[PDB]
Write a protein that binds this DNA or RNA. Structure first.
Length: 1240
RNA sequence: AAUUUCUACUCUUGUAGAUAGCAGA
DNA sequence: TAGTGTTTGTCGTC
DNA sequence: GACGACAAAGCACTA
């Protein structure tokens, strides 16, 4: 097995896109015939027909729901039993019962069953079949069910073109399917409305039994309105009536028995919805509801469990406090011997149940009520102060955009507040409160959608990428390149002087007309035309044209002699009866031999069948020319799989023949041919440099090597698109103006966005104002250029453009899908223990950081990827963008940041693949399922980086390096295939081919010399008793006079209540308060050893500002003040406890806080070092400021190193494992135990 | 500030990387 | 009594 | 029992 052998394993399909430039006067001919305008109208017709078909989509659904008659007694009993006993058996019984009822409704739409009489059951299938076919426009489906003339004229607009609704058919299948999917009609009937209707019947009978006078009163309300005249009030609250509550008109009548593109568009619509909130007085109603909570019974006001953690973080210290406070109070009221099983039951109960507001107050204290009152009035005042604040006149200025966002934040804040309360009727909700809350709520739901629509408008770009597909009045345009379908499709390609041209033949005067392109000698100058020959598949096309056609099937049925085929045959073929009988556990198939076992009959029949196929190919009118003599005789063919896989590549072929330029130019001159040059900036006159990957795929497809031996196949079903211009604001660099580079003299540090505009205006002498102080300072550093030629901003969308989306297939000689790809990778890895690793982590001072390690674990190379292609993406560019978002906090700045991150990550995968191929390594990412990263990290968690991993998997599916020759492995003809096909984020686990995913947590805050981690969670120390109990668990803390350090011995079998439950290896540790000394690094720079950056400034705000702190110096100073003598080397902790100085104990613990903190960062001073608190086996505490290459350089370096180290643990278990499998993730304790043992 | 277009850019009338489209969210 | 402008074929997995 | 990929086979229109 070789690493270069990971190619040609499965087919990968990519569709290239190009721009079509009209040649000669083909644009004039198109405009004269009005093809673009007609196709533009077809786009509008397709969109205007979107609800018309959806309307004729209800008719059928409404008609099918009118005949539904079911007995809902069984469904009610399954609902009652699940509410009665909360066991998993009654849940699965209800899930199956619901699925049975959903299918009962589905059988009315398309039953294909025996429950409904076929007279009716089969009639629905004839409609549902062509509900996703042409029938829609035939009027046939409407003939089964009245169309108006304009609607009839709209249906015929898609005659011979109903494939335009291809994707729309899928969107309508997503509406039915009769699954638990909420989008479906059966689900809405069974699982949404019936539990509501079933509850209505129970509410009815309880009221009528207690207050019988309410019966005649309800009956009078029904009679006074006029609804359900043939049904009494008791029957509408009985199960049989629900069958007549399945259509909207009946649902509306039932509910009424109960109830009785532009800038100013966002201002007019919002102000219309905004002024509607005053008339409804939703603020006054909301302010009155939250004021009711001061006196009403709070044991029936429930908080949703999905919001409890969010509320805890908004009203308390952490997200933990509420869930923990409820946990302690519930453990406080358990019965008998409180086992650890009873505690876990209380934990699991708090995850998925709604807590009433009273139990929260009784468990958290009176300080939550003050937080609840203050937060409620704060949100209500902001929403009240925003409804009366008028919107601006326009959105031209950013100051006017800010007030629009500010008022939307207040509206979304109130909308967020209302979603705190549980909506489900499973809880005993208050009568009046739940009704008034659900009312103002139903009203605030479009705010969220409206808010999202508004934010996207600000994020939107001034372009209009919207486009429509050009058909040229052909439903099969560019649907196939075969020469025999020249007229049928009318799309061919030309190559001339390295420039690729597309030629489409229009219907000449409304009729098909072939062009007699005469093959001219190659010497004469002219275009080269593609001759495309293709036989789709031997398995499906051969029987269709030879033994399964209408002629021979009927002939063999009514006549028992072989028949001769003459049409589409050079020499007549004598198809005989037996081979058709074989094709009538099919015969000559693997199943037949597996079951029957007639091996002798198999080999003879297959020999005749294979010979018959070989007989067919040499006799067919188009397959006779291809040289099939390379095929082996039928005696040594095992089965059809190997034979068809061998026969298929021989059929497909592309050849080029020169066509004289005079014919092509005259064809364009008269208008018979439309010439479109393919253009992707790699065919420009001034082009110089390595081209795009898509250009190489296009260039490599037509290379002489590929034509002789196919590895890139030109797939059919190509598409043409036309994009209208979007010239609304043209910016240009006119001649005589002075360009300004976005980078300084070093062409690596970008100018801030705000400063760049001011400098650019001053350079051109256009700014009326004066430059800032920092603008003057940065002025000499910028570089200016004169405009030699005009550069048009966004020139792509200035004018109208054509497009050509063409699909190609790479690795055409491989299988359709990979077959156990991970087994192949694991096989290579097992035989190659020396395969290096590549660990990638998201640092804070570095966007993406890399570290490669070998089998033994030494760091071969570690690099920071924030500087790609001589440009700084983090140290300068992302910092300025983050500065702007912290200054303005607008929507445009957020959109630019997300686009930059995705663009930066595109550059990263090139660095990864270039690094990986050079080392022949395996790259280990981190799975997003486990853990999270802080806000200080440069990439948002599970939002952009999750898509980053998708790109890396997809890129390595068909990895092609653009500096490589095509013939060797890794080129365009033989791409690398190192990853399995991506299916979903959930399905990918710990391996995706040559990619590994190890748990993120417990990777970057570890000493790389001892494997030590901070074993104490500091949230368990709050009071003096906790501090003293924590401090008394240690063994001994003493001054070493020889070295000047403090050795704080600790045994992991102590302070369990303050620990994190991960002992790991090394049951004892020696925390060292390193003596501060001006140590020198490799470069000789001075740095003080043991320096720690502590952010603790206030009890509530623990990261107000970073503060310098020296654990050794401060603790010596603290002990001197207390009068403690410690130079004798005696233990210090017992003497600390006996004096019982509250301030000294707090300082004692706070210093242990600092020393156990390894990752010390300071953005202002540029320090991101990591310092070990414990000594290694050599006896030296790790300090990353030493800049030793063999160990991580900075804090971000440590994380990428251990992700690669976590990759070793996966492979180390892989090598020793007998099976070719991997563990379903790495336990945090198991990883800690492994690393702590290895570093020793 | 020039792109099948996405990001960044301007020694180079263009550079470096990415780029599986259509339809529907 | 024909030019010409939707149907069918499956092999393996799934 | 359920998916496909592009051709050549059919199949209805007027003639």
């Amino acid at each position: 097995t070789q690493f270069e052998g990971f190619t040609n394993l499965y087919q990968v399909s990519k569709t290239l896109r190009f721009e079509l430039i009209p040649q000669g006067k083909t644009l004039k001919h198109i405009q004269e015939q009005g093809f673009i305008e007609e196709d533009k109208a077809r786009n509008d017709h397709y969109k205007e027909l979107k609800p018309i078909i959806d309307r004729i989509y209800k008719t059928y659904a409404d008609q099918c729901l009118q005949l539904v008659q079911l007995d809902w007694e069984n469904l009610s009993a399954a609902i009652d039993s699940y509410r009665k006993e909360k066991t998993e058996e009654t849940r699965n019984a209800l899930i199956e019962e619901q699925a049975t009822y959903r299918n009962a409704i589905h059988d009315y739409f398309i039953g294909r069953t025996d429950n409904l009489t076929d007279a009716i059951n089969k009639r629905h299938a004839e409609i549902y079949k062509g509900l996703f076919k042409a029938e829609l426009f035939n009027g046939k489906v409407l003939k089964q069910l009245t169309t108006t003339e304009h609607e009839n004229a709209l249906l015929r607009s898609f005659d011979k073109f109903t494939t335009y609704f291809s994707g729309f058919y899928e969107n309508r299948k997503n509406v039915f399917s009769a699954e638990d999917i909420s989008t479906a009609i059966p689900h809405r009937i069974v699982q949404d409305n019936f539990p509501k209707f079933k509850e209505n019947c129970h509410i009815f009978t309880r009221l009528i039994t207690a207050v019988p006078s309410l019966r005649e009163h309800f009956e009078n309300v029904k009679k006074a309105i006029g609804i359900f005249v043939s049904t009494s009030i008791e029957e509408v609250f009985s199960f049989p009536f629900y069958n007549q509550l399945l259509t909207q008109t009946q649902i509306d009548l039932y509910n009424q028995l109960l109830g009785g593109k532009s800038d100013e568009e966002v201002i007019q619509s919002f102000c219309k919805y905004k002024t509607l909130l005053r008339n409804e007085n939703v603020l006054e109603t909301a302010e009155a509801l939250f004021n009711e909570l001061n006196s009403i019974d709070l044991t029936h006001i429930f908080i949703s469990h999905k919001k409890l953690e969010t509320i805890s973080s908004a009203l308390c210290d952490h997200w933990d406090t509420l869930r923990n406070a409820l946990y302690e109070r519930r453990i406080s009221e358990l019965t008998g011997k409180i086992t650890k099983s009873a505690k876990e039951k209380v934990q699991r109960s708090l995850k998925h149940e709604d807590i009433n507001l009273q139990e929260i107050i009784s468990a958290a204290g009176k300080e939550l009520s003050e937080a609840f009152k203050q937060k409620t009035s704060e949100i209500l005042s902001h929403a009240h102060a925003a409804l009366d604040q008028p919107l601006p006149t326009t959105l031209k200025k950013q100051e006017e955009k800010e007030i629009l966002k500010s008022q939307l934040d207040s509206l979304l804040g109130l909308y967020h507040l209302l979603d705190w309360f549980a909506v489900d009727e499973s809880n005993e909700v208050d009568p009046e409160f739940s009704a008034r809350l659900t009312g103002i709520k139903l009203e605030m739901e479009p705010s969220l959608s409206f808010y999202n629509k508004a934010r996207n408008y600000a994020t939107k770009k001034p372009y209009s990428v919207e486009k429509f597909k050009l058909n040229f009045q052909m439903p099969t345009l560019a649907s196939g390149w075969d020469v025999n379908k020249e007229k049928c499709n009318g799309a061919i390609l030309f190559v001339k002087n390295g420039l690729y041209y597309l030629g489409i033949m229009p219907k000449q005067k409304g009729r098909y007309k072939a062009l007699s392109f005469e093959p001219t000698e190659k010497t004469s100058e002219g275009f080269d035309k593609m001759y495309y020959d293709y036989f789709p598949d031997a398995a499906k096309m051969i029987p269709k044209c030879s033994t399964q056609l209408k002629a021979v099937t009927a002939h063999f049925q009514t006549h028992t002699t072989p028949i001769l085929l003459s049409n589409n045959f050079i020499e007549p073929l004598e198809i005989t009866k037996e081979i058709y009988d074989l094709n009538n556990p099919k015969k000559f198939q693997t199943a037949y031999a597996k079951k029957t076992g007639d091996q002798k009959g198999y080999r003879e029949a297959l020999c005749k069948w294979i010979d018959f196929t070989r007989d067919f190919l040499s006799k067919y009118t188009k397959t006779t020319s291809i040289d099939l003599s390379s095929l082996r005789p039928s005696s040594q063919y095992k089965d059809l799989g190997e034979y068809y896989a061998e026969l298929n590549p021989l059929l497909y072929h592309i050849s080029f023949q020169r066509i004289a330029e005079k014919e092509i130019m005259d064809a364009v001159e008269t208008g018979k041919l439309y010439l479109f040059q393919i253009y992707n900036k790699d065919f420009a006159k001034g082009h110089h440099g390595k081209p795009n990957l898509h250009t190489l795929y296009w260039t490599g497809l037509f290379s002489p090597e590929n034509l002789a031996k196919t590895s890139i196949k030109l797939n059919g079903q190509a598409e043409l698109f036309y994009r209208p211009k979007s010239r609304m604001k043209r910016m240009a660099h006119r001649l005589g103006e002075k360009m300004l580079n976005k980078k300084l003299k070093d062409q690596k540090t970008p100018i801030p966005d705000t400063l760049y505009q001011e400098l650019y205006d001053y350079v051109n002498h256009r700014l009326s104002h004066d430059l800032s102080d920092e603008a003057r300072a940065l002025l000499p550093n910028v570089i200016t250029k004169e405009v030699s030629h005009e550069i048009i901003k966004d020139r792509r969308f200035t004018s109208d453009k054509f497009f050509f989306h063409v699909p190609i297939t790479l690795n055409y000689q491989a299988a359709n899908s990979p077959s156990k790809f991970n087994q192949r990778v694991n096989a290579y890895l097992k035989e190659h223990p020396e395969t290096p690793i590549i660990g990638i982590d998201r640092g804070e001072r570095n966007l993406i950081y890399i570290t490669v390690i070998d089998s033994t674990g030494k760091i071969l190379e570690q690099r920071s990827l924030n500087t790609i292609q001589q440009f700084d993406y983090q140290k300068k560019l992302d910092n300025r963008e983050k500065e702007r978002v912290a200054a303005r906090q607008a929507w445009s700045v957020v959109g630019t940041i997300k686009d930059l991150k995705q663009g930066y990550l595109s550059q990263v995968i090139h660095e990864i693949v270039d690094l990986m191929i050079h080392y022949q390594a395996v790259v280990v990412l981190e799975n997003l399922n486990f853990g999270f990263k802080s806000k200080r990290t440069g990439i948002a968690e599970k939002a952009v980086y999750q898509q980053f991993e998708k790109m890396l998997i997809d890129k390595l599916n068909c990895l092609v390096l653009k500096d490589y020759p095509a013939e060797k492995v890794g080129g365009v003809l033989n791409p690398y295939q190192l990853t399995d096909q991506f299916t979903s984020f959930a399905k990918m686990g710990t391996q995706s081919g040559f990619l590994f995913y190890v748990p993120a947590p417990y990777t970057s805050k570890i000493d790389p010399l001892t494997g030590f981690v901070d074993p104490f969670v500091w949230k368990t120390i709050k009071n003096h008793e906790s501090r003293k109990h924590f401090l008394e668990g240690f063994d001994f803390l003493h001054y070493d006079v020889k070295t000047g350090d403090f050795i704080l011995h600790f045994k992991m079998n102590r302070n369990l209540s303050f620990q994190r439950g991960l002992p790991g290896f090394m049951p004892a540790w020696d925390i060292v308060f390193e003596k501060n000394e001006t140590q020198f690094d490799a470069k000789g720079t001075p740095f003080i050893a043991g320096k720690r950056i502590v952010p603790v400034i206030e009890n509530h705000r623990f990261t107000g500002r970073y503060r310098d702190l020296y654990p050794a110096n401060e603790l010596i100073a603290l002990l001197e003040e207390k009068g403690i003598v410690f130079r004798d080397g005696s233990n210090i902790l017992p003497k600390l406890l006996e004096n019982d100085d509250s301030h000294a104990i707090d300082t004692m613990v706070a210093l242990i806080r600092s020393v156990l903190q390894m990752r010390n960062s300071n953005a202002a001073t540029g320090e991101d070092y990591i310092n070990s608190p414990v000594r290694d086996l050599n006896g030296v505490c790790f300090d990353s400021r030493f800049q030793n290459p063999e160990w991580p350089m900075d804090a971000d370096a440590n994380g990428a190193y251990h992700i690669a180290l976590k990759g070793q643990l996966l492979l180390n278990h892989l090598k020793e494992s007998k099976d070719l499998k991997l563990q379903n993730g790495i336990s945090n304790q198991d990883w800690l135990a492994y690393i702590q043992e290895l570093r020793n």
